[PDB]
Amino acid sequence: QPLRKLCILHRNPGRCYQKIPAFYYNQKKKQCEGFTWSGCGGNSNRFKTIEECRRTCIRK
Structure with a gap:
């Protein structure tokens, strides 16, 4: 079964510094790699801990 949409909208931080x-799910590494969120923008794929990321991005 496939993963949720939140794990494939691409880690868009936004234009805000x-x-x-x-972290975000790296679809090469196949684990949550770290990513820096901007300030006032972006999509989703925001995950604090790698496990928490994988719960949704790797499936239960």
Whole structure:
């Protein structure tokens, strides 16, 4: 079964300069790699912990 949409909308931080650094699911590595969120923009794929990321991005 496939993963949720939140794990494939692509980690778009936004145009606003660094403010919520966290992680995103890297579809090469196949684990949540770190990504820096901007300030006032972006899509989703925001995950604080790698496990929490994988719960949704790897499936239960």
